[PDB]
Amino acid sequence: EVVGGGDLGPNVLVFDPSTPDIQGKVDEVFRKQESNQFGTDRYALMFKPGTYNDINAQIGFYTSIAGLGLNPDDTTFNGDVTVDAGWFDGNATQNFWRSAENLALNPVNGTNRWAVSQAAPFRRMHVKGGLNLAPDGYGWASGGYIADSKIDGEVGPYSQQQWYTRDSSVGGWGNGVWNMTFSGVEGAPAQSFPEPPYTTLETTPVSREKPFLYLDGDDYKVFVPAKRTNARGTSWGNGTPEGESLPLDQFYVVKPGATAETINAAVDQGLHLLFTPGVYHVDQPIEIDRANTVALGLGLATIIPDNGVTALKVGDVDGVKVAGLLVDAGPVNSETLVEVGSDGASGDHAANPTSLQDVFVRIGGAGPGKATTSIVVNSNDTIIDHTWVWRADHGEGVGWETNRADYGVHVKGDNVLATGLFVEHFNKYDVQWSGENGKTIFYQNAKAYDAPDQAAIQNGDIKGYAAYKVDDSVTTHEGWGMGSYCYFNVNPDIRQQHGFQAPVKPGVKFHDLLVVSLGGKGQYEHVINDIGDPTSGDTTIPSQVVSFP
Numbered sequence: 001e002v003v004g005g006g007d008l009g010p011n012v013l014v015f016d017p018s019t020p021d022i023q024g025k026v027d028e029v030f031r032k033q034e035s036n037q038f039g040t041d042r043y044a045l046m047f048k049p050g051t052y053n054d055i056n057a058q059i060g061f062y063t064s065i066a067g068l069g070l071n072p073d074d075t076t077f078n079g080d081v082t083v084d085a086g087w088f089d090g091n092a093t094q095n096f097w098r099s100a101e102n103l104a105l106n107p108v109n110g111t112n113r114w115a116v117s118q119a120a121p122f123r124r125m126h127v128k129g130g131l132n133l134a135p136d137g138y139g140w141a142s143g144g145y146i147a148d149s150k151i152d153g154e155v156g157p158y159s160q161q162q163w164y165t166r167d168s169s170v171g172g173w174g175n176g177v178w179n180m181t182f183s184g185v186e187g188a189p190a191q192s193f194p195e196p197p198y199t200t201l202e203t204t205p206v207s208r209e210k211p212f213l214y215l216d217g218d219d220y221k222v223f224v225p226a227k228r229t230n231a232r233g234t235s236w237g238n239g240t241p242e243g244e245s246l247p248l249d250q251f252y253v254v255k256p257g258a259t260a261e262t263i264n265a266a267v268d269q270g271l272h273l274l275f276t277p278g279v280y281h282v283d284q285p286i287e288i289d290r291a292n293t294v295a296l297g298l299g300l301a302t303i304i305p306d307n308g309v310t311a312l313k314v315g316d317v318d319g320v321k322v323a324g325l326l327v328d329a330g331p332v333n334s335e336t337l338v339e340v341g342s343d344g345a346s347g348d349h350a351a352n353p354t355s356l357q358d359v360f361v362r363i364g365g366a367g368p369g370k371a372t373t374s375i376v377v378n379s380n381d382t383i384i385d386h387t388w389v390w391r392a393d394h395g396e397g398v399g400w401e402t403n404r405a406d407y408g409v410h411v412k413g414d415n416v417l418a419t420g421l422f423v424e425h426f427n428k429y430d431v432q433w434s435g436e437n438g439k440t441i442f443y444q445n446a447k448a449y450d451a452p453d454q455a456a457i458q459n460g461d462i463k464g465y466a467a468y469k470v471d472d473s474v475t476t477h478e479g480w481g482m483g484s485y486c487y488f489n490v491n492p493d494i495r496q497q498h499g500f501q502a503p504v505k506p507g508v509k510f511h512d513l514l515v516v517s518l519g520g521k522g523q524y525e526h527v528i529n530d531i532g533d534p535t536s537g538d539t540t541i542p543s544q545v546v547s548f549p
């Protein structure tokens with residue numbers, strides 16, 4: 001019974017090079033979206049191919065900006081896509097929930113400013129000049145994620161604490177701070193941790209670029225890249241990229257209105273999903289149990305699970321590409337928010353894996369919300385390529401109980417790969433890995449700030465719960481470029497035994513680990529298990545470990 005394609009709706013603004021009032025108009029969204037951290041408004045600015053002049057697209061909360069060509073240079077700005085921190089007094093550590101993709105940029109002073117923190121991906125971009133990742137004045141910042149991009153000149157992180165870059169091309173990298181990690185990046189600074197703190201891998205073992213809306217001439221369509229093993233450099237610049245096109249008309253177009261039963265019925269029926277920029281309350285989980293289903297969000301499209309249900313469940317099928325969505329906890333506790341595969345699933349998905357890309361989870365912050373576990377990854381071979389799983393530390397509806405969320409991510413399948421894993425503030429283990437031969441490239445954690453007292457975070461004989469816990473049974477794991485920080489702002493007497501916990505086996509390895517106390521609010525006793533120096537002083541110097549075991 002459902003109906004494919006049709007109309008993307010008001011919240012998706014489709015600019016062209018003869019379109020009137022682009023500056024003034026891109027400027028109204030920012031005005032309302034600049035300081036709008038928890039609003040329900042959602043926007044995507046989409047630009048048709050061509051060259052656009054005298055422009056500076058300033059990007060606020062819940063704003064995605066993109067070109068609608070196939071290769072990034074089809075849509076060129078003699079101008080800038082700018083993220084700054086004027087609204088929060090130079091501090092960029094709340095510059096969340098926005099994105100830029102599939103544009104070239106010829107920045108007006110020779111350098112584009114993308115001063116963001118978490119959940120602010122920069123994908124499929126060509127910067128014909130510099131890329132400055134810090135707010136004007138080298139004030140605080142906690143990014144960040146760049147993939148499938150070419151920066152002609154220098155990337156300058158400056159004050160950025162940490163960063164992940166994959167499968168890209170840079171002609172310079174200026175500096176590290178705590179953890180600037182690279183995989184498959186031509187031009188990456190040579191590996192050197194802790195000095196500078198560069199963790200560098202030549203290729204990404206597998207990656208698959210995120211699907212995106214484009215105009216194959218007159219028609220709305222989505223292009224869906226195929227996977228690369230040992231990816232290095234960009235995917236677009238040599239000629240005809242690799243992967244499929246879907247016509248629009250083979251997508252259900254979800255808008256304000258949609259029930260979860262119709263969304264699933266459209267996937268029953270053989271349609272893909274395109275979530276328009278909106279907030280979707282669902283009282284049954286969204287279910288994708290058809291191989292190769294693309295589920296693509298625009299304008300930070302957001303799902304909220306009502307009645308304590310799970311928001312999104314992927315079945316044990318090959319090739320599901322979930323991209324560009326925020327799952328936002330309801331006030332009724334959900335046992336899970338996202339499940340990838342059913343519990344127990346023992347099959348392969350190796351040739352054609354399921355992935356989550358730019359999938360973000362929030363618990364609290366916009367009022368009261370809670371979940372026991374946020375993401376369960378049951379399916380073997382799953383790719384998690386950019387996720388921010390975040391128990392709110394600030395905002396409305398936040399308490400050590402009021403927005404309690406015990407567990408962030410739990411990985412149970414085998415062969416699972418996370419590139420750009422950001423997980424923070426959970427009451428217990430932020431990340432748990434139970435499956436075999438897991439790989440994590442780049443991890444950023446901060447522990448819960450609102451732990452009341454030592455006794456509240458006790459873990460048998462461990463003080464605190466690891467930010468990242470590989471199970472005792474696991475025989476095979478390997479991780480690179482991983483940091484956990486603490487700011488026990490309620491009770492800075494607290495001690496966190498470690499950032500990491502894992503068995504001591506010849507084939508469970510870690511490379512370039514660090515923990516950091518933020519201005520002496522709590523301290524780490526060790527880095528991993530019982531190994532590594534404690535943090536000390538209020539000077540926020542990392543305690544580091546190059547190699548383990």
Ligand SMILES: OC[C@H]1O[C@@H](O[C@@H]2[C@@H](O)[C@H](O[C@@H]3[C@@H](O)[C@H](O[C@@H]4[C@@H](O)[C@H](O)O[C@H](CO)[C@H]4O)O[C@H](CO)[C@H]3O)O[C@H](CO)[C@H]2O)[C@H](O)[C@@H](O)[C@@H]1O
Nearest residue numbers: 093139140141142158159161393394424446487518519540
């Ligand atoms: O609070 C809400 C959000 O905050 C996120 O965590 C922040 C955290 O980012 C912040 O850390 C700062 C660091 O940014 C800072 O690094 C320095 C660099 O700025 C500088 O250029 O280089 C040196 C190193 O040589 C560093 O000085 O260092 C100060 C310490 O002096 C840190 O405090 O601290 C905030 C709280 O104090 C903290 O909240 C968090 O990830 C988000 O989840 C959260 O929503």
